[PDB]
């Protein structure tokens with residue numbers, strides 16, 4: 532799987548344009564804002580966008596999803612249904628940061644643990660990883676050993692759990708039981724900061740010790 | 742000032758019907774839900790409802806405000822503007838607890854620190870007390886030494902500050918600098934649990950020591 536990271540919004544979130552090398556069929560993961568910047572990269576890359584994927588219901592991951600879905604004529608898929616309250620609360624999310632109103636978002640379909648999403652010949656496995664948000668999912672490409680994981684895990688950190696319905700014990704358990712077993716060699720693209728691997732975090736991440 | 746407490750919603754919130762004894766002009770503070778229960782008490786009390794007052798933007802304090810405002814033909818007044826994001830997020834608030842959708846609420850006017858609200862011959866002084874929510878206000882009747890204070894202070898407790906834009910240092914400072922100086926003899930009607938006085942909390946509330 533090929534990809535391009537597109538930093539979007541004032542929160543500087545790692546939106547991912549991902550695509551199959553043979554078919555050039557593509558997906559956007561977490562198009563958080565800066566819809567024009569995203570469109571410019573998508574259009575200049577020459578790929579065929581087929582879908583928008585959402586890891587979780589937070590503003591900096593979903594702000595441009597509705598505009599891009601309409602622009603390209605593609606579905607918005609994900610996250611898990613427990614984040615519906617966050618997506619319904621997008622106006623409140625944006626108003627809290629003094630930003631322009633982000634409209635409520637209803638995805639074409641929710642995702643569940645164990646779902647398959649096809650990006651041309653790339654098969655993404657969906658893993659439900661709650662703790663940061665109760666509906667947070669991640670996308671795993673087994674063939675390229677690549678994880679697109681939103682705000683579950685960072686290089687030397689983990690997602691905040693002090694939000695409504697956040698749960699630290701739940702988040703750490705999800706990382707250890709669902710992510711780490713995918714293998715040390717797995718690279719992850721987090722929502723913020725630099726990329727890292729699961730192996731490096733297993734042994735160096737201060738939140739994953741004990 | 743006369744009053745009647747009307748426990749509403751599954752959160753068992755202390756909605757207040759308050760009124761002037763001479764004129765029988767009345768106000769509702771925090772009509773949180775159970776709109777029929779509220780209407781039954783208001784109508785049976787014989788008072789003339791003139792206004793709805795809001796201490797803060799949380800679901801269990803505002804759920805029935807819009808229906809009652811329309812039913813009686815009265816304004817919704819308060820809280821302070823910083824809670825606009827909470828009122829915009831009412832659908833998200835209710836969806837989070839698996840309840841029926843509560844619509845976004847736009848009050849007739851926001852309140853500010855130092856505002857006067859007239860309930861017949863009762864003059865309420867408005868105090869801005871952030872920390873639980875950034876737009877939280879309280880209503881003080883100096884003549885009857887009575888405070889209607891929402892979720893700022895409880896008997897032996899204080900409002901949670903772990904919500905988005907919550908701030909514990911700010912909440913405690915607001916209590917100590919804006920509430921306690923009103924006098925030890927002041928009775929308060931909190932959003933939850935039994936009534937108490939400012940004097941008792943000053944000396945016994947574990948959150949107010951030091």
Ligand SMILES: [Zn+2]
Nearest residue numbers: 544591682722
């Ligand atoms: Zn993020």
Ligand SMILES: [Zn+2]
Nearest residue numbers: 754801892932
């Ligand atoms: Zn309350």
